[PDB]
Structure 1
Amino acid sequence: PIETVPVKLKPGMDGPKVKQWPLTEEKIKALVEICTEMEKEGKISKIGPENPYNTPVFAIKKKDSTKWRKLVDFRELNKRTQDFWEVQLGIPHPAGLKKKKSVTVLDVGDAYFSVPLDEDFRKYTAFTIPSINNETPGIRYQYNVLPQGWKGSPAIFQSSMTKILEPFKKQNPDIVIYQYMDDLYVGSDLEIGQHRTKIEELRQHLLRWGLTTPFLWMGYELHPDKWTVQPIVLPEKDSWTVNDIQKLVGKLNWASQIYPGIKVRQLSKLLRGTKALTEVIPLTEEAELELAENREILKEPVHGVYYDPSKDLIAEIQKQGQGQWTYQIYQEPFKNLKTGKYARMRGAHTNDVKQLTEAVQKITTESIVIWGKTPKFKLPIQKETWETWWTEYWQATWIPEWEFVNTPPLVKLWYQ
């Protein structure tokens, strides 16, 4: 007998009309079974072609998990649904989460199926299960309850969620808890044993409400305190070739867009003649000071760079080769909030696409913990290549926005 929270799309926007993409046999089987079980329980219901909306669905296995998990690509619906910040439903973000020694990620999406969804909004959650070789036309369902993956569901569930966690919080007031979509981020400074213990307590605590008023048991362990930053570094040499100094000057001139006090006059002079790229040339006294001054400037942080909660986050990734990937997170060009590098991820030396998928997942996770937002990615990959393979490697319950770029590396800017 729970009353449904009304929900409206942003004025002047239609619902999502995104076509279902082809699914592998194992994925279609998982979805048919999952949707069958969900239909018996009233969680979804069958619909026809007169509902004009559609949102893609597929299935994933989380890290080290053997059980299929339904995933709806609600990105379109999420960007067409009223921002709940205006409503005041939106969750605040704790600056302390990133400072904790251990942060565990808990899947709690299952909870959301307990709460009815506003009748007038249900039509927007339409999805179509496809069939191998198109044996059947698509089978359309829509949601009756709060669906996993929709940004409205944690908003509307916040009330029940805060009430449920209230005891545990008061007992252990040092532990930070942040809710993002279908996930719970639980951070503490305890020793690992007592941390996992407290997570286990919280799990059983959630079951006690589950008994009274994909699975919960899984849990992933982050350590935000140890998250390194990868800055811009100039090479160190005793002998410089003409090639080296041309590279150094091109790099410094690019950097000058980030640190304005950087100068290349003294270094550029060393390049006056028409010399063989391979010629060794002694650095002039002026040039040595200029280089040293530039290392100093690069050592200090950029001026006037800070997080604006109203602006979107953007992430760029470069493929550096040998399993190394660099990234920058920013809101305004050349004002990077964070820079970093990944190496030796799953797929190194055999599968670029798996590596990039992991990179995107890693960066999104860092952005959620640090800012409570997911960035829009500029992916260094062809659209067709990405779209063909990425769902084979996706292990997260959210999906960030992305776009495709092709930027030949003319300066080895973020990696030497």
Structure 2
Amino acid sequence: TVPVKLKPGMKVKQWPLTEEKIKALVEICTEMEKEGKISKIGPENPYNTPVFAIKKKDGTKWRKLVDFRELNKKTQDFWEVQLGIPHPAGLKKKKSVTVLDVGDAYFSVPLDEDFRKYTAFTIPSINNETPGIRYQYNVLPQGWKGSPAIFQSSMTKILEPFRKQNPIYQYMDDLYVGSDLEIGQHRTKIEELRQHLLRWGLTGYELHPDKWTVQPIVLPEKDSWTVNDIQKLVGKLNWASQIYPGIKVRQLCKLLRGTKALTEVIPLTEEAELELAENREILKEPVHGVYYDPSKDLIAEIQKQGQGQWTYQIYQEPFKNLKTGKYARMRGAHTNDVKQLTEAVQKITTESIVIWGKTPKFKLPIQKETWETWWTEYWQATWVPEWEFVNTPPLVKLWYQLEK
């Protein structure tokens, strides 16, 4: 056991759940009560934590998810300053990365007596017929940042025979292993570590971090240009001047002299062709003055393009992107506006952990009421990223669609 305390100086409302989800959570909570994981508490506890139900692929059954987002902000001094997890810069460069879930490992180690009251959660009822079943964690919960911090002292010891054998990174309840081995070799070496987990007693998903190469923004290659083609081009590039200081539209604007029709064909001169071709070279080459800052928070913004196309940007400061790209669609069967966004958010979050090791602030083009209802249906990950809901400008939407 280890004493845990809050930040000096420093209760969330439960979101309504479906009739099927509530009955599923009751079944899990009753099983965990008999095992000695959680216990019932009275109304004297004012602290509350949101609870949601998610589905798995391998287990096929329902999984319990607790949103410790509000609690993790108050417990930031414990798992970062007091017991911080070291992050290497060599994880981002590998051939194949495999992710495994080890969330069942935290259900064994007991929790601090004085800190148990802050992990309390309430199960909601249909039409508020029953007062609502109350529970609190007796052991280390999934989704809490203090759980891997306490287990760290035991996690380094069990990974020592594995590290000495092969000259790995832990984040939340997920484990990240990177290797430069072959396709057939990678699957065997992961099983060797998986069989080692069973020795201690605890229990097509594959990543390629070298294939995350940033795709450059390409400009339309046109044989014959019209006034309307220039006007749309100048407007897009002038907005992109604050991102890339190399882009200029001065010679493209001198092509338009006086009032002209949009259909009118304008031939590109020596000034226009040489400027436009130079601007294409600046878009292909990475921009200068972009660096990672550990002190500042990471921001991620996603835009909807339509026809099953989504684009995203990862940045710390506006107009200064560290990682860009576009997630099209999980092609095939049934995909909607929520599902394609849910699959994108989880993919961006996973990429953020490998390279940097922090969850970014998600800017979403969706309403608060619409997102909070349907996000649980397609959610699989145990980590909950902090999100906000904002407006999407027309200029940013028309720029990142030209990205290859």
Q: TM-score range by the shorter chain?
A: over 0.9
Are the structure 2 counterparts of residues 318 and 54 from structure 1 closer, same or farther at C-alpha, using a change threshold of 3 Å?
Answer: same
Does the CA contact (< 8 Å) of 2:79 and 2:145 recur in 1?
A: no
Matches within 5 A, 1:270-289: 270-289=255-274
Instruction: Quote how far apart the aligned CAs of 1:127 are.
Output: 0.4
1:158 is displaced (CA, Å) by 0.5
The answer to whether the 8 Å contact 2:300/2:314 transfers is yes
Task: Give CA-to-partner distance per residue, 1:327-366, whole Å, 9 cap, x none.
Answer: 0101111111100111122688751111001111110011
Mean CA deviation greater in 130-139 or 183-192: 130-139
How many Å apart are 1:90 and its aligned residue?
1.4
- Aligned partner of 1:201 in structure 2 is 192
Please tell me whether the aligned partners of residues 129 and 138 of structure 1 are also in contact (alpha carbons under 8 angstroms): yes
Contact 1:346/1:355, CA 8 A, preserved across alignment: no
Q: What are the residue-to-residue correspondences of 1:106-117 with 2, within 5 Å?
A: 106-117=100-111
Secondary structure at 2:377's aligned position in 1?
helix
Query: For 1:363-410, what per-residue CA distance to the aligned partner results, in whole angstroms no more than 9, with x for missing partners?
Result: 001101111111110001122211221111111111111111122424
RMSD: 1.8
- Corresponding residue number in structure 2 for 1:60: 54
Distance 1:194 1:299 in 2: 35
Aligned CA distance change for structure 1 residues 123 and 88 (closer, same or farther; 3 Å): closer
Deviation at 1:246, TM superposition (A): 1.0
Instruction: Select between 324-333 and 192-201 the one with higher mean Cα deviation.
Output: 192-201
Partner SS, residue 336 of structure 1 = strand
- Note closer, same or farther for the CA distance 1:379–1:86 as it changes in structure 2 (3 Å cut): closer
Cα contact 1:328–1:340 (8 A) shared by 2: yes
How far residue 272 of structure 1 moved from its aligned partner, in angstroms, is: 3.1
Given that residues 104 and 185 in structure 1 are in contact (C-alpha distance below 8 angstroms), is that contact kept between their aligned partners in structure 2? yes
**Counterparts of 1:272 and 1:378 in 2: how far apart (Å)?**
41
Taking only the aligned residue pairs, the percentage that are identical comes to 99
2:86 partner SS = coil
Give unpaired runs (5+ residues) of structure 2.
Answer: none
* Residues 212-261 of structure 1, C-alpha deviations (whole Å, 9 max, x = no match): xxxxxxx8321111123233322211212211111111111111101113
**Aligned CA distance change for structure 1 residues 371 and 67 (closer, same or farther; 3 Å):** same
Report the Cα offset of residue 94 of structure 1.
Answer: 2.1
> Are residues 158 and 359 of structure 1, via their aligned partners in 2, closer, same or farther at CA, if it must alter by over 3 Å?
same
Is 1:349 aligned to 2:346, yes or no? no
Distance of aligned partners of 1:333 and 1:190 in 2 relative to their CA distance in 1, 3 Å threshold: same
Separation in 1 of the partners of 2:228 and 2:150? 60
Task: Give the whole-Å Cα distance in 1 for the aligned partners of 2:146 and 2:318.
Answer: 31
Contact kept, 8 Å, 2:4 with 2:78, in 1: the verdict is no
Cα pair 1:250 1:411 within 8 Å, conserved: no
Task: Go from structure 1 to structure 2 and tell me whether the alpha carbon gap of 1:143 and 1:168 turns closer, same or farther (over 3 Å shift).
Answer: same
Distance 1:304 1:378, change over 3 A: same
Offset at residue 110 of structure 1 (A): 0.8
Task: Give the equivalent residue in structure 2 for 1:163.
Answer: 157
**What secondary structure, in the 3-state scheme, does the structure 2 residue paired with 1:116 have?**
coil
Following superposition, the deviation at residue 142 of structure 1 comes to: 0.7
Cα distance in 2 for residues equivalent to 1:33 and 1:135? 18
**Partners of 2:75 and 2:285 in 1: how far apart?**
42
Answer yes or no: is the 8 Å Cα contact 1:323–1:349 preserved in 2: no
User: CA–CA distance in 1 between the matches of 2:196 and 2:173?
Assistant: 18
**Residue of structure 1 equivalent to 2:41:** 47
Contact 1:322 1:348 in 2 (8 A): no
TM-score (normalised: structure 1): 0.92
After the TM superposition, which residues 11-410 of structure 1 pair with which residues of structure 2 at under 5 Å, given as runs? 11-13=8-10, 17-63=11-57, 65-84=59-78, 87-173=81-167, 177-210=168-201, 220-345=205-330, 350-410=335-395
The 3-state SS of whatever aligns with 1:98 is coil
Distance 1:58 1:370, change over 3 A: same
Q: In 2, Cα distance between the equivalents of 1:48 and 1:303?
A: 58
- Secondary structure of 2:98's counterpart equals strand
Report the Cα offset of residue 135 of structure 1: 2.6
Question: Secondary structure at the residue paired with 1:231?
Answer: coil
Q: CA deviation at 1:312?
A: 1.0
Is the Cα contact below 8 Å between 2:99 and 2:176 reproduced in 1? yes
CA contact (8 A) 1:53 1:123 kept: yes
Instruction: State whether residues 322 and 349 of structure 1, in contact with CA within 8 Å, keep that contact through their aligned partners in structure 2.
Output: no
* Deviations 1:88-129, CA, capped at 9 Å, x for gaps: 421112222221111111111111111111111111101001
- Structure 1 unaligned regions, length at least 5: 212-218
8 A Cα contact 1:75 1:401, kept in partner: yes
More deviation, 342-351/398-407: 342-351
Q: Deviations over 1:245-303 (max 9, x none)?
A: 11111111111101113211111122232222222211121111111121122222111
1:323/1:345 contact within 8 Å kept: no
> In terms of mean alpha carbon deviation, does 349-358 or 361-370 score higher?
349-358
CA distance in 2, matches of 1:85, 1:394: 25
Structure 1 residues 90, 346: closer, same or farther in 2, change over 3 A?
farther
Q: 1:206 to 1:369 in 2, by over 3 A?
A: same
Equivalent residue pairs, number: 400
- The 3 A distance-change label for structure 1 pair 352 and 43 is same
Deviations 1:40-78 (A, max 9, x none): 122111112211111111121234540211110111111
8 Å Cα contact 1:323/1:348 also seen in 2: no
Does the aligned pair in 1 maintain the 2:338–2:371 contact within 8 Å? yes
**Residues 1:306 and 1:159: Cα distance change in structure 2 (over 3 Å):** same
Distance 2:382 2:332 in 1: 21
Q: Structure 1 residues 110 and 237 mapped into 2: Cα distance closer, same or farther (>3 Å)? A: same
1:214 corresponding residue in structure 2 = none
Q: How far has the Cα of 1:186 moved from its partner?
A: 1.1
8 A Cα contact 2:79 2:146, kept in partner = no
